[PDB]
């Protein structure tokens, strides 16, 4: 019986890690490194997800930009993030109920698995939307800030890590319900 | 001559990361119908058209159809791009 418990708790901790990645990219400090070292003068952008920093050293807001329909894509994006987090927390809650019975079960666990799948389904869409938006932000001449060092992460990759956290959670818990 | 990269060129790396993650997401769904077993079955799904052995609809077989449609679209787009 120690085996199933170790599997379950391991999956719980893994999904907790995924939540840490969720917080990680929800708290991105610079989504993309950026530069415009114009031979004007040298420039180094550091675009946080809601916080376009410049680097003397400075960080700036710059959120909710062009254009309109894209802003709505941001709405769907953030809503998808919130529901993502909700499915996470419901997952951990169903895990805690499993702990309470460790202190349906199957019928409950699969539910969380499903939600976690849904969670994984949403954020992977969400980031697309975000990346979609980001490309669009680059596509429309980003005011002046159009860095050549275009690149995602670091934290966005962690958003994927929380994704695969929910994924592995769902897989191992499915391995548990298959019992 | 490019090494390896030239094959990679027609479709962006990000798109690859996306198709990979998406497939991984599709993969587990088959297990829900039932970490290794049905994931292996999904490995038996991408390899050939899409999914099998579903006792008429059930649940994930329609996922197999959507997945078939999906991989179909992507490979078509890829080939068109290289062209």
């Amino acid at each position: 019986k120690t085996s199933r418990r170790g599997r379950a708790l391991l999956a719980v901790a893994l999904n907790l890690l995924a939540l840490l990645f969720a917080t990680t990219a929800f708290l991105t400090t610079y989504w993309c490194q950026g530069t415009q070292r114009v031979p004007f003068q040298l420039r180094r952008f550091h675009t946080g997800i809601w916080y376009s920093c410049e680097e003397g050293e400075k960080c700036r807001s710059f959120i909710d930009l062009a254009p309109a329909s894209e802003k709505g894509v941001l709405w769907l994006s953030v809503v998808s993030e919130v529901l993502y987090i909700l499915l996470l927390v419901v997952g951990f809650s169903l895990m805690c109920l499993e702990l309470l019975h460790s202190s349906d079960g199957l019928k409950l666990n699969a539910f969380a698995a499903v939600f976690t799948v849904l969670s994984g389904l949403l954020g992977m869409v969400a980031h697309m939307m975000y990346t979609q938006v980001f490309q669009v932000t680059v596509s429309l001449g980003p005011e002046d800030w159009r860095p050549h060092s275009w690149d995602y992460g670091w934290s966005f990759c962690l958003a994927w890590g929380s994704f695969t956290c929910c994924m592995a959670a769902s897989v191992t818990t499915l391995n548990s319900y298959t019992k | 001559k490019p090494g390896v990269f030239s094959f990679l060129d027609p479709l962006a790396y990000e798109i690859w990361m996306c198709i990979v993650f998406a497939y991984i997401g599709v993969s587990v769904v088959l297990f829900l119908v039932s970490i290794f077993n049905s994931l292996w079955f999904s490995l038996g799904a991408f390899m050939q058209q899409g999914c099998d052995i579903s006792p008429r609809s059930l649940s994930g077989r329609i996922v197999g159809g959507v997945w078939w449609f999906f991989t179909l679209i992507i490979i078509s787009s890829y080939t068109a791009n290289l062209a």
């Binding site: 697309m128 979609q132 | 798109i15 769904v29 829900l32 649940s59």
Partner: peptide, 29 residues
Amino acid sequence: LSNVAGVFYILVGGLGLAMLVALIEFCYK
């Protein structure tokens, strides 16, 4: 990546729909 992302959307949506079908099928039983 966008033009394909639109297909990602229908993919994921089909996934969730099929999941709902799995749920009601778990409801009959």
